[PDB]
Design a protein around this ligand. Sequence first.
Ligand SMILES: C[As](C)(=O)[O-]
Length: 504
Amino acid sequence: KVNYTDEETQKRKKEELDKLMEPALGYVTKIPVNIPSVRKTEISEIDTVTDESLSLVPNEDKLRTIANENYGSVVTKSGSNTMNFVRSGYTIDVVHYGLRDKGYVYYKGVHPSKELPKGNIIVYQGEWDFTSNADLDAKRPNYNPEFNGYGAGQRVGVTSADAKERTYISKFNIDFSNKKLNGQLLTKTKENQEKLRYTVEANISGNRFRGKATATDKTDPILGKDSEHLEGGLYGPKSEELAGKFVAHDKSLFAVFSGKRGNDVLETVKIIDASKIDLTTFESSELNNFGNANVLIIDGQKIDLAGADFKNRKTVDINGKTMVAIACCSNLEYMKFGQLWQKEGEQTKDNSLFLQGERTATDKIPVGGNYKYVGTWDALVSKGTNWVAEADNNRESGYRSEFDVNFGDKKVSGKLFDKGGIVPVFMINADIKGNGFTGTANTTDTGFALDSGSSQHGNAVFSDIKVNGGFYGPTAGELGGQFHHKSDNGSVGAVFGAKRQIEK
Ligand SMILES: C[As](C)(=O)[O-]
């Protein structure tokens, strides 16, 4: 009166929806509420969830604050009683009236899966929830057989919480051999009759899936619009569970869903490596990753690692912390490694090395043939003084990593050089198993001087340090790995990557 909104073109609307396809630990949206002069409020406030705690309900704090100041009553559904790695549902003020916030609908999960079942078709079952938009002109009946009260969905978004004695159940079939999923979102009445509301189809990439939800009944004034923007992820170390959301193409619905597979013991395969070595404790810890090795996830937030140079320094603010990553290399398409630390003004804290890669499928690991791989590496050795390897582009005399891989004998042989070194400082010997390798890193008998480069200073020696690595890319044309050891006799953390060679 008069109400002005931004004129959104169809192109802009698609772009907006496309943005919502970015993988994240979770997502949350506000339940729409009409201001007095408007007749329709779309679903518009859709935020990523970046915290990693399963006990934190997205925006429940914001809601309880408003509820309390208005004597409301907050109720929260998460599925916390069934799921171990995912949460899905709503937090809602059930005695809501007027123009104040009603609540939120969300999903989130922890430990995006780094191992998937090897193959076959696996069943996941869970629940789903939703909020509609608010619309006076959507033919939503004053009396609704499915939803409680007067004019459900008309002035305030209607939700799964408002249903009359109905349960909202989800079922999925994941075909891990073809990386495809299908599913059904159903409603069950008190008389135990099921009605299919949406069919879901999606493709799996990394530990995420992207696809669509097709409304089964387009005459439904609330659950009647298709989505071409469904996205979710597998969660748990071994894809024990899933969770995701979809947004109706007209922003008239935001649905979330969860799922859990049965107790059957399945064989799994590694799809992702993503970890870091702390350069003070020389301990390894896992990083969150969604299957894109060129994206570094810190505190549920992302750092693009790609850049114009051989290796690139990225500097990103994450929760008031200035993170710095030096990521190598531009010739590696399916993996990245390098340094990571917190910029503490002039100093630096939590110095670490990281490595990420997208594992080759086991059935694409070559069965025979001998290949050279060439790349570089990053390392810290400490034994009184510090010795360092910093990733570089000098194949002749730099910090070279060189490998001979014999796929026939399932052997990897590697050499890690110091700059100017004529003999390597580390020798790697490993066995190939599935899409990775494991073995040892050894210095020579009498090892290498901590360069310095001093005629009184010490020498470092390491014996049978455990090495873990993977093959990355469609046909294992890239390889990488790491090793770490903590000792008073000397310590080391090292990451390396290399690119398969062709004889020119
Ligand atoms: C193109 As890629 C290695 O980020 O899947």
